Assembly symmetry: D2
Homo-oligomer: 476 residues x 4
């Protein structure tokens, strides 16, 4: 089974006013599995009024009470994690084992942010005149509009929602029409835990119509988007025209630097595992493997061996470790990336093809001998493709790593302090993981640089985009 999804407005699950719905298909099959309410402008006016009213309510609830309510939502997300994961796998394609991991960590994230909300500290500044008190108070910015994409239906809502809620903001999210049930199950946990009516809202419909209406509207004080770099540029431009606070989490093109002193088995296990996680459909997925010439061939073979050991299948089989891609455009885009690679003289080491003629299954693919003008080494592939090149000198790996307008994550494998320290200072990324896969715990900052966007969704830094800082000076 798989349920139809409704809008959440003012504490109620409701149909759109007009009754219109959008069909939802299972990517592993191509067959309808349900429908989602298609909101129009009238449903949006009701969500906005409600968000305003919810903000006036929520900002008055003391932080410790807000925290206890959020921890209650978290316990419910944990309990319902298998049922929610089954919804997710069906609508998005990832393996059930991966969906379960995603939802359980959603509960972890909520819990950390609930406690963070109690530690939004102000400051007292030693004054220039002892007869005055000089303070810096932090307070919530107001109603937030969030736009979240399909690759992690739950986890891309959960950080934004948790940070908003921990600060005293209300929250109105447009989630993906193609993966709508698992984000709605997340918000249902919050409604059941006692977050009052209007603090949270959820809508689905025509993405352009919704974002063009919410972002200029005077109820909304803060906008947050995660998605593609070109769509973000369009939304950050609209937000700027209406002077709205904005954060953006966009495309990455993560380099992997395998230094001469690297453990190779480890690199392959850690970066290769990470590459094929959610079929490469991750803003932090390692893409450009820069491997020292001394071990390049050995690395390339071991990666090929890892790709070929993946069990492609419908994500509901527990043994499936590579599911279908999320939707048919991902096939088109993977076909295009692989064509261009062949055309520019790269070698397709394994994979490189659609599997079957039903659903969106594409084969895990490793490209070697990749020239620098290849599409895969310039545009974000966002799919189950690795591209390998060699280097001699660590300084040339770093410059390659920094060549692109992205961005976001980077990985490396090395053992010397000197290399760790050099990669730390020089690599143009928001997050760098060395000798392990990505472990984006909620207490670590998470966000990009350059075209990958700005603002963090972890650590205390994650609260700041939702806060206003106010200087107060009172002469006694």
């Amino acid at each position: 089974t798989y349920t139809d999804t409704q809008l959440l407005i003012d504490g109620e699950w409701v149909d759109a006013a007009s009754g219109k719905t959008i069909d939802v298909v299972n990517p592993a099959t191509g067959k309808p599995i349900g429908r989602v309410a298609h909101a129009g402008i009238a449903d949006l006016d009701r969500a906005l009024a409600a968000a305003q009213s919810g903000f006036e309510a929520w900002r008055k609830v003391p932080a410790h009470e807000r925290a206890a309510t959020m921890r209650k939502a978290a316990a419910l997300v944990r309990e319902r994690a298998d049922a929610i994961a089954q919804l997710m796998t069906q609508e998005q394609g990832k393996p059930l084992t991966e969906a379960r991991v995603e939802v359980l960590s959603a509960a972890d994230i909520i819990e950390w942010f609930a406690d963070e909300g109690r530690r939004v500290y102000g400051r007292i500044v030693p004054p220039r005149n002892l007869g005055a008190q000089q303070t810096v108070v932090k307070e919530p910015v107001g109603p937030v509009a969030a736009f979240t994409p399909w690759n992690f239906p739950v986890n891309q809502v959960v950080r934004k929602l948790s940070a908003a809620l921990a600060t005293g903001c209300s929250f109105l999210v447009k989630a993906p029409e193609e993966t709508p049930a698992s984000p709605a199950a997340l918000l249902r946990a919050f409604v059941d835990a006692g977050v009052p009516a209007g603090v949270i809202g959820l809508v689905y419909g025509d993405p352009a119509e919704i974002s063009s209406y919410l972002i200029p509207h005077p109820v909304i004080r803060k906008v947050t988007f995660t998605g593609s770099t070109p769509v973000g540029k369009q939304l950050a431009s609209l937000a700027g025209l209406h002077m709205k606070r904005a954060t953006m989490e966009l495309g990455g093109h993560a380099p992997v630097i395998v230094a001469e002193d690297a453990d190779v088995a480890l690199a392959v296990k850690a970066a290769g595992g990470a590459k094929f996680r959610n079929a490469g459909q991750v803003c932090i997925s390692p893409t450009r493997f820069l491997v020292h010439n001394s071990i390049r061939d050995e690395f390339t073979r071991a990666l090929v061996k890892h790709a070929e050991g993946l069990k492609v299948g419908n994500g509901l089989e527990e043994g499936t470790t590579l599911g279908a891609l999320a939707n048919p455009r991902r096939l088109t885009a993977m076909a295009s990336v692989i064509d261009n690679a062949r055309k520019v003289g790269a070698s397709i080491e394994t994979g490189g093809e659609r599997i079957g003629s039903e659903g969106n299954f594409f084969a895990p693919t490793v490209i070697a001998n990749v020239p620098l003008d290849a599409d895969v080494f310039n545009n974000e592939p966002f799919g189950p493709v690795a591209a390998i090149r060699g280097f001699d000198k660590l300084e040339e790996a770093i410059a390659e790593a920094n060549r692109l307008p992205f961005g976001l994550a980077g990985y490396a494998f090395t053992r010397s302090f000197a290399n760790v320290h050099l990669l730390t200072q020089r690599l143009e990324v928001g997050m760098l993981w060395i000798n392990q896969p990505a472990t984006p715990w909620p207490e670590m900052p998470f966000g990009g640089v350059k075209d990958s966007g700005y603002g963090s969704e972890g650590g205390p830094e994650a609260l700041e985009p939702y806060l206003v800082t106010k200087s107060v000076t009172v002469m006694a």
Copy 2:
């Protein structure tokens, strides 16, 4: 004496390749006093290249060395304060005494920021696996494009410049064509102190063309603009379209709430004195005077008396306490504000006319019986005009204070703790001063909310728009 001003590119004071200049007028007389170079695209290209190199240089200079270099520049600014102030008054209109105060407070800013650059701290997070070290590191964002207005020619530059230098970014500023010499003099103190070629640049010319070229350019990593709300919106739109970090300090419309228990005489002294400072051409200037009805008449008359005491004349003549407005557009703008007040039934209690027929002199003006639809109570007048309205309940004054889309500064006068705490919580402003005029020290955050923009220019918060946060996790 008044000097002609050049562009600063890659260590060198130079003319524009085209040789073009713009005439500089003294607002007190209407008479030409000098000229400034009118930069074109070609000179911007050399500034941008120089900025790139300067960033590579300055990012490598240890913070304690950057700090000592910045502190020398500040010592130079102090040494040259009379000369700088003389240039400012001539080009901008303010009295010599206020110019000197601006220039000295510039030095105070540079010093605080010099020291703050040494305290851009990272952090170490207790890890989930004890074999890994989880750190968060702070780094400079990159080359900055800055755009600054004419109201405080030196001070609007210095906070942006100081922030950028303390973090290790390079800095390219477009300063006002109408007030070129005093900022160029500030920049010349930094060159003479030892800031290397390319780290700082200064251009003048057509503002639209400079903005449109610098903001989309891939060398610029971060944009900062101080100015009016409409231009900031156009600039933030563009920044967004090209995914640039942006901060904005825009229009204010500061309410002043004089409560039933206020010390009226202190209220007149503090907020009257602040009103006519720089002839009200200040983003935090008290404008909407909300006075409890019990003391409204007493307050109006005392404010009228304070306006009448002011000595209007040329800024070089000692005695002068209110100079000329900075340009002919401000006179037209004041007559419109006053014509509208009268049209809508308000009473001009004093002032309200041009003085003489040469230069930009406007009498200090107090308006009462102001209806809620008068231009002065909706648009930022940015001029030597106070508007007074009465209230009965503090709650009504608070709701009026929040009514407009602006939210920069707020003022109040009251003695009860409960009202301090209420005002602190409820007022939608970035900065609030109670029982005193504004004292915007560099250690205090300084920035807006709503249509007044975002990002702070004081406190440790002023460094954050100039920094990227990198999560680094290394497994042993």
Copy 3:
């Protein structure tokens, strides 16, 4: 019912080696209710070995796991709060309603410290040479010896224990022989929640023999004591002789300043309620009431009215609001304080006598017209006695407030910002509460100044006495 109490050593509840026990009496009755193991030196050697081994174990458990374990202990303390409170009332005398409040808030404290342990942050310092990394790491100091008194058997263990546990330290507490069962029930929750063997230890016996042995012993790296000022001086002296880190929470003598603009009903309700809480047996209990002459008489009558409305009785009756004093020396000391008051010419307004001839019931007592040489206005009474004097000028109240070598808490009632600000800057206390009773939440610092001791048991500051800070600089 009421249970006999054992030692906790190495995960096991055990008798002392020798079999010796100490009888426990109910203060409301004077009758034996049980016994507690009397530890000797051999039991201490076993506790110390175990604490060493527990420290090596606990310091290796990642913080998030430590937190989850502590939150589990907390949920068990919450569930068992009524059963634990019944033990407490019996052995200590406080009303059951007060005992329940104490234990429930113990669970709150644990939960806040569990999350605090995850936020023990290090720092990265911008280096003087870019080739080095300069860091500040925080790590646990080691095995802690804690000595806790009888007035709040559970809450004086719980803060020390929680802070130790959140930092990675092991913990060995000597709890009170006269109130031993409710602290043992607290530690039992931690054992049941999965804190491993030896991380926590609990012993009872001859207070001088235990503290003389634990404090010099090389396993113990940190000592913490809460109790009387003269006993602390002796223990801080021993700790200093063996160079052991020490914190001390000692006697208070809390002033209450009721200013001329005070709400009187509120002052009486808030400070009077607080005075008779746990029969005045609290280091923060308001003792010296300094009331403005204009309302002194009205305050004195309303306090008398509050004291006379207390229902004296055995604490197990739900309606009892003043229980018996904790032990027979409290009667002797209250007899002495009241004698001296009468002798120096003070007036006993109500109470002043033992009630009955069984148990330790003393009457709630209010003394007025108190000269400055009266014992009650110099030595900490630690019992159900208030002492009232007048003042004319707020500055004279403050000097009186600051006259004594204590210390700890202070209270006031006033409405003006000016007074709030003056009391804030001038009053020599660790904690100041204004227009309310004490609400010592775990997120607020808690500790004294002067003879009241040093170190805080709340806020992040509470972790620092358990941490070592290490500067690390590594040249690449």
Copy 4:
């Protein structure tokens, strides 16, 4: 030239009421050079009264004014660096070049602390009831009694003095009778800068009698001592008996771990150079050289060569790189250390004798084949003596590094990240420097663990022993 030194009391350089003096010797010659006033109880009484008044004064001076005053003092210290260094070398023994370095680094300290005084921040805690404001405020503790040793006469004073002045405490120091003039000269820079009468005081005399009088005295709120472990224990015992805040910087015994992958030449240059700095009379001097057996012989010979290169002679003669030891007790102490090394079977590889028959000259000495029971490997030698021992496993070196009750500084040389991280975690020291000598900058914490005491003299942490934390909760 060398000058006689006086007491500094309440703004005035004065003699002791008794008129007594102590002779000051030049350690390089044995010859008298001057005298210092020998303070008695009566002069201490005037210092204590003056300290009380000075505290009342300085606590009222806004932090930005305190900072500017401190920065002037620092500018004076720089101006007078040759003169101060001349006094130091004469009285203390170190070469002129090292004295000048000490004096200049003093100025650097004062400046950092000046700036840190402006950033003693309080905080605002999200409240449990929104009608209350919960703040935590920082205040100066009160008058300080400081006791400082002869090894860095100016530098051991300056950190304590700077900390105390930045927080707003007053300061009374007993400096070394054997090296009086250079600290008095430092204190004279603060008097000439404008620090008011009473805020700073300076006495000399009988150390025991001064200590016993100042520590129990009710004017003294905080004690700080730098010195040997046995005297610190006696002083901490007394501080404790009178419930005074105390910090202690005591004996160190720094291990140096040269790992199998070390750069041996850098190891010799960094830790050899640091060994003979101030002829090893430093609390963080490398002493126990633990060298991997593979490179031990290479290391020993290179260190012997570096010791042999040093130029022994009077500190005023240029060329001199190792001066005389500071007093005759240090010669006796070195002969004992060397007599014991030889008795226990170690080999003296170079040095190990007195040079000449006048003054306190000792040859730079390297000892190898050192058994674990030799005095040099258990007691702090505080002299120009390195002891070398080999190891096979890094784990054995780490367990030796931790074996002693001292734990001040530690050094290592290694290239692998895993060893940096291991050493960082496992070494029981306050400060660790890897691949470089010690660089104790004022922004880095500086303090011990175990028998080396407690409290930091660097970083923001250096201010915390000089501050009290006050929780303030005000209900509207």
